[PDB]
């Protein structure tokens, strides 16, 4: 819900999410919905965005309607910020536990240290039940299973209310006597030296001594109870394991790419050269959270959002199977309503009219190769 506002070229070339799969679409309270997939950190990272040297894998939901139970990059839990390498491909697995009923647009966002949020595709996930049914039990190392929803709430309320009561008593002690104009006039007309006198100073000593003793005694009690405490855990996790993808056997060179203004279509020309020994067919073009699919080549079975999917939005001029070793030039047109719904057409307003995306070439046997494309995006007005 955070997207459609960011720069179009920036959404096009920061991070490419693909192979996204949501475990559930209609979850109940306490039931677990898991988001998996792979995200590829783009090589041509925008310079205005700091490199993902300190990046935290987040999830974009309105408030904590889902608690993030687990989140992995590679194969290891990453509860803190991590370092990502530009050009590498990582796979993630975010485990979410439902907490609040309703229709929630759960996005998979990524936060970079000095570059802001990179919201990925989001899927409407419905939750049924009641919030009061939510249970979040966690077992500490000292041997106490505590529910995070209400743990320490009573102690917090008691201490805050006690200190507020002490402050209110301290204020009211002077509020009993007349406050502003009489005291102002006593101070103005000569020495006052009667507005503060015994036993007011004795009450002041009482308040100060009571405050010091109360703080010290409470600290000592909070050291006897809870005798084992550790500092807040922090620190970027370096050395994320990136996916060891095979080198693609298809090389795509983009010879100019245009989009009509105003319009919903993207025109782009490629010179596909297929290596190896299989006939490839261009089947999908993922540019920025939007998948333009070729119905004749690939059909989506992963439950991608309808507003982010172009089932037949990708039209290739010459989509016959491409024999190995052969190179050919085709006119690829990705036209869909999402191109203007998600304001992909406002790249004209951006200070860098350059695009990036993923092309998915599929073979007859069904296996695919993911190839990258990036080229300047020249608007067309005539």
């Amino acid at each position: 819900h955070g997207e459609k506002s960011q720069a179009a070229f920036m959404r096009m070339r920061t991070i490419h999410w693909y192979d996204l799969s949501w475990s559930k679409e209609k979850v109940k309270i306490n039931e677990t919905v898991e988001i998996k997939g792979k995200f590829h950190v783009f090589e041509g990272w925008p310079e205005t965005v700091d490199e993902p040297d300190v990046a935290f894998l987040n999830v974009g939901m309105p408030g904590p309607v889902f608690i993030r139970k687990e989140s992995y990059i590679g194969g290891q839990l990453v509860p803190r910020s991590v370092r990502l390498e530009i050009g590498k491909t990582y796979d993630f697995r975010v485990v979410l536990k439902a907490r609040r009923p309703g229709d929630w647009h759960v996005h998979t966002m990524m936060n970079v240290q000095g570059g802001g949020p990179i919201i990925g595709p989001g899927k409407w996930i419905t939750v049924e039940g009641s919030m009061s049914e939510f249970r979040n039990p966690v077992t500490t190392l000292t041997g106490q299973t505590v529910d995070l929803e209400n743990y320490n709430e009573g102690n917090t309320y008691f201490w805050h209310a006690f200190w507020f009561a002490i402050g209110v008593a301290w204020i009211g002690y002077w509020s009993r006597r007349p406050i502003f104009i009489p005291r102002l006039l006593m101070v103005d007309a000569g020495r006052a030296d009667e507005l503060v006198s015994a036993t007011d100073r004795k009450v002041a000593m009482g308040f100060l001594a009571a405050t010091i003793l109360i703080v010290v005694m409470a600290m000592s009690s909070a050291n006897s109870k809870y005798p084992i405490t550790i500092p807040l855990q922090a620190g970027t996790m370096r050395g994320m394991k990136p996916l060891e993808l095979p080198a693609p056997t298809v090389s795509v060179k983009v010879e100019d790419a245009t989009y009509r203004v105003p319009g919903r279509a993207m025109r782009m020309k490629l010179t596909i050269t297929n290596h190896g020994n299989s006939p490839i067919r261009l089947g999908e073009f993922y540019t920025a959270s939007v998948r333009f699919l070729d119905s004749d080549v690939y059909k989506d079975t992963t439950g991608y959002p309808e507003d982010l999917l172009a089932e037949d939005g990708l039209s290739v001029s010459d989509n016959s199977p491409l024999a190995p070793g052969e190179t050919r030039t085709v006119d690829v047109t990705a036209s869909d309503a999402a191109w203007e719904v998600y304001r992909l057409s406002d790249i004209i307003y951006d200070p860098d009219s350059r695009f990036a995306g993923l092309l998915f070439f599929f073979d007859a046997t069904g296996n695919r190769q993911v190839v990258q494309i990036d080229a300047p995006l020249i608007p067309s007005f005539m």
């Binding site: 819900h1 459609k4 506002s5 974009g60 802001g116 502003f180 104009i181 007309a189």
Partner: protein, 236 residues
């Protein structure tokens, strides 16, 4: 008479209107209020922005113009009882202004803090930005300027001279409204993260300091009370 039940209305109008605004933003914060480009968001919140701006400009003009047209020219001929009644009415104006300061600079300000701290910013006119920057800020600006005009045109103490501390109290919190530009120039530019202690926010901090001028304001109002309604009784 003296202090009438205008104080109850002054507090109650703010309380009722701001509770209704809180209900409105709690109903339309999500689901027509999450996405800034949906057709329903323009009908539920862009309309909020336009109606509230038009109404606030009209109300500011009408209130200031009325309070300046009905100004008391013959301030010398002022009985001490009427002067004390006007002092109490000015103190009611200050109470209303303080209530507006609270509602604008604490409640809706930290509501915007929660809003943009738990979602991703989508525009310059998010629901909570509309509620805080363009509703509550102009409301207390209007009330502060109205209290200024009332004090200057009715109170013999505050007339014959523009009060420096009370001018600061009326203007500093006003400068927070043009400081909204730095807020947006900050998040879009220098602070590309939802950090809420970063220097882009020091603009409100500097003019949050200028609201400390209520100290001089209230000692000046006490001095104004201590001319005719001096008593006596105090100091004897």
């Amino acid at each position: 008479l003296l202090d009438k039940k205008w104080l109850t209305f002054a507090l109650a109008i703010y309380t009722v209107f701001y509770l209704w605004v809180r209900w409105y933003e709690g109903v339309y914060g999500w689901s027509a209020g999450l996405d800034s480009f949906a057709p329903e968001f323009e009908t539920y919140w862009m309309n909020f922005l336009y109606t509230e701006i038009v109404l606030e400009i009209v109300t500011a003009s009408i209130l200031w113009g009325y309070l300046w047209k009905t100004r008391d020219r013959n301030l010398a001929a002022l009985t001490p009882r009427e002067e004390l009644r006007r002092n109490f009415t000015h103190l009611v104006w200050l109470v209303a202004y303080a209530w507006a300061i609270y509602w604008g600079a604490s409640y809706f300000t930290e509501q915007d803090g929660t809003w943009h701290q738990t979602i991703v910013r989508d525009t310059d006119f998010t629901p909570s930005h509309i509620i805080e920057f363009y509703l509550s800020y102009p409301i207390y600006i209007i009330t502060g300027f109205a209290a200024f005009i009332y004090a200057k045109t009715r109170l013999p103490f505050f007339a014959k001279g523009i009060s420096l501390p009370y001018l600061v109290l009326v203007v500093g919190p006003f400068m927070i409204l043009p400081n909204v530009g730095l807020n947006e120039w900050g998040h879009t530019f220098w602070f590309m993260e939802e950090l809420f202690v970063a220097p882009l926010h020091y603009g409100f901090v500097i003019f949050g300091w200028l609201a400390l001028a209520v100290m001089g304001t209230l000692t000046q109002t006490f001095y104004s009370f201590a001319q005719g309604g001096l008593g006596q009784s105090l100091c004897e």
